[PDB]
Design a protein around this ligand. Structure first.
Ligand SMILES: Cc1cc2nc3c(=O)[nH]c(=O)nc-3n(C[C@H](O)[C@H](O)[C@H](O)COP(=O)(O)O)c2cc1C
Ligand SMILES: Cc1cc2nc3c(=O)[nH]c(=O)nc-3n(C[C@H](O)[C@H](O)[C@H](O)COP(=O)(O)O)c2cc1C
Lengths: 219, 218
């Protein structure tokens, strides 16, 4: 309820060190996957793909992208239980929209073939606007993926799962490591999940945010 | 875990709110704390939030949903509280120092070396976005979308109906509140309330790609 959600938002923090001996149970792993798969997205575009690494070898592959100037994020990836790599589509076309329309049809979203056509016209409008008017389709799809990351950070907290969102990685190295670009995807945020180690210095520091008077305008 | 999954599954985009039901003050205070506490790259918090709960407040916002975006009008007027997520239009050295000072007042830095450290680290990412990738506004809006994501789930966890809206005239909404001159721009509207019994999307099932399609387990 309100107590538990405000508590989950205040108690979560960006874990800097995970307990390498503790692993997430299948029940929490399955809840994490369902949560991100069910995420909302503009016109239900779901322009994403997720790599979920639980093996030591799989996490080592992801950690190749956190070397040199990004080495400070390496241990978070290697010591965590599960590492989720959020990927966004690099482009979107008519063929993707029709696949999406068909999956919605098979899920019983439309009463008539007319309501199906309506959803397609409405979606094609927002999509073509971003592709050709604002010319920011790739950034717009990345925004949907960040919204999803948001659901996972709060959701993980509510399940007593420690997490840390990571942008400090070489996306070119990570993309090449999983052939994402060739598949029409690019990595944008890495989120390791697990349990913080007691030595994690960031777990004892207070959370800092702008004051309410600064970020809100009530009318 | 079971209740947060049920949250993700039971929430949906409300197409009609009950104008007579209002959120309890305990949940509004929660909504506000939730979005203020959201994470962001380098704690950038590149946002501002308009929380409209009066008929006037909502009507002003509703000016942004007219013509081709009229289908979202009833949503903004009939909800209890409407949250307009705004993103910074630009980010400069002064904002980073301001942010550093707020972190310092909150006790994040044991010594000046940690304060200088955090500033050097955040300056690197911000300067990279402003001058190397040249995508600063997009980067900042992505942090804002991350925040919207916490509200959609959080709302659901509090059994609150909430619909994210992109179909509005940002120019009209921004001009209505003088946002651009103040260094902000509206990106997502999220009305919060309780759906009405005359809601068609509340009875339809939720469609998403399958697990085999969106996941790669390694
Ligand atoms: C998009 C995004 C990317 C981030 N990338 C990193 C990262 O590469 N390394 C890191 O240590 N923390 C990273 N963080 C954690 C932020 O610094 C953190 O969210 C912010 O300081 C707020 O503190 P909290 O997460 O503890 O509430 C990231 C956060 C976000 C939202
Ligand atoms: C960023 C964003 C913007 C949205 N904007 C609108 C909008 O302007 N009008 C609308 O009817 N629905 C809007 N939606 C609702 C989406 O259609 C919805 O998230 C998607 O169809 C998935 O269904 P659900 O939200 O019911 O789970 C938006 C969703 C997101 C994530």
């Amino acid at each position: 309820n309100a107590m538990t959600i405000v508590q989950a938002a205040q108690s979560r923090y960006s874990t800097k060190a995970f307990d390498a001996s503790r692993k997430l149970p299948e029940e929490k792993v399955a809840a994490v996957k369902e949560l991100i798969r069910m995420s909302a997205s503009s016109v239900n575009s779901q322009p994403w793909h997720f790599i979920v690494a639980s093996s030591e070898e799989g996490k080592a592959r992801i950690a190749k992208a956190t070397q040199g100037g990004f080495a400070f994020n390496e241990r978070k990836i290697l010591d965590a239980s599960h590492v989720v790599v959020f990927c966004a589509k690099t482009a979107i076309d008519e063929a993707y929209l029709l696949d999406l329309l068909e999956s919605e049809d098979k899920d019983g979203r439309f009463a008539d073939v007319e309501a199906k056509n309506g959803m397609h016209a409405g979606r094609s409008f927002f999509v073509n606007m971003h592709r050709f008017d604002l010319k920011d389709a790739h950034h717009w799809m990345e925004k949907q993926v960040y919204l999803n990351v948001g659901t996972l950070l709060l959701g993980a907290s509510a399940m007593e799962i420690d997490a840390v969102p990571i942008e400090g990685f070489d996306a070119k190295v990570l993309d090449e490591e999983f052939g994402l670009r060739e598949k029409g995807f690019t990595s944008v945020v890495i989120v390791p999940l697990g349990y913080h180690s007691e030595d994690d210095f960031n777990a004892k520091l207070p959370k800092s945010r702008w004051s309410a008077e600064t970020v809100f305008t009530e009318i």
